[PDB]
Amino acid sequence: TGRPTPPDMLDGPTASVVCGLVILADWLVSQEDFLLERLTSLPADGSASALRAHFETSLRRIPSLLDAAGLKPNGLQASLAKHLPCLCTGPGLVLITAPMGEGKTEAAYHVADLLGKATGRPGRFLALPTMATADQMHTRLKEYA
DNA sequence: CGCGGACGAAGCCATACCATGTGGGCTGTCGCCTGGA
Numbered sequence: 001t002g003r004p005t006p007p008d009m010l011d012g013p014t015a016s017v018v019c020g021l022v023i024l025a026d027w028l029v030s031q032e033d034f035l036l037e038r039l040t041s042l043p044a045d046g047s048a049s050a051l052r053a054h055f056e057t058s059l060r061r062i063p064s065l066l067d068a069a070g071l072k073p074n075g076l077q078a079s080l081a082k083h084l085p086c087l088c089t090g091p092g093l094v095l096i097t098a099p100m101g102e103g104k105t106e107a108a109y110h111v112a113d114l115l116g117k118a119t120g121r122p123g124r125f126l127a128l129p130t131m132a133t134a135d136q137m138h139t140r141l142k143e144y145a
Numbered sequence: 146c147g148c149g150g151a152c153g154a155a156g157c158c159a160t161a162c163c164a165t166g167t168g169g170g171c172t173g174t175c176g177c178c179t180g181g182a
């Protein structure tokens with residue numbers, strides 16, 4: 001791995017998220033074939049050369065599984081889009097309370113995505129307490145992004 | 146009218162097949178008669 005240095009400190013949450021990372025990679029390469037796939041160029045010995053090679057071949061193509069697995073505006077919108085670009089300095093939360101069916105969605109992904117750029121993470125996630133809303137806005141809201 | 150005895154009102158509950166070794170305690174026998182010590 002290149003003999004990394006020791007980190008002077010760590011905290012719980014960091015260890016939790018990176019634990020999700022490690023278990024993710026484990027389950028990742030874990031899948032069956034794989035296994036059978038590369039089950040042809042087995043290492044003959046354990047010297048640094050052969051292990052460097054095998055590790056280097058996984059580095060050659062791991063993204064295979066990655067992509068193979070799939071991984072007139074209203075007043076409110078004008079006021080948030082108007083003044084909010086000054087307040088968007090970093091991580092926080094925006095609680096929006098708009099009338100039913102008025103279009104709170106537009107301001108939701110507008111500000112949500114501007115702030116996503118402010119924090120630097122493209123993907124998002126919406127939790128809805130129904131079932132048909134997922135299957136409807138899944139497409140309704142996908143072809144514009 | 147004054148009252149005995151009996152019940153009921155709840156707070157409670159609880160994703161990376163296999164094994165056993167142990168012991169010991171109770172019973173009475175003759176050939177009889179003469180001779181010598």
Ligand SMILES: [Fe+3]
Binds near residue numbers: 026030
């Ligand atoms: Fe593993």
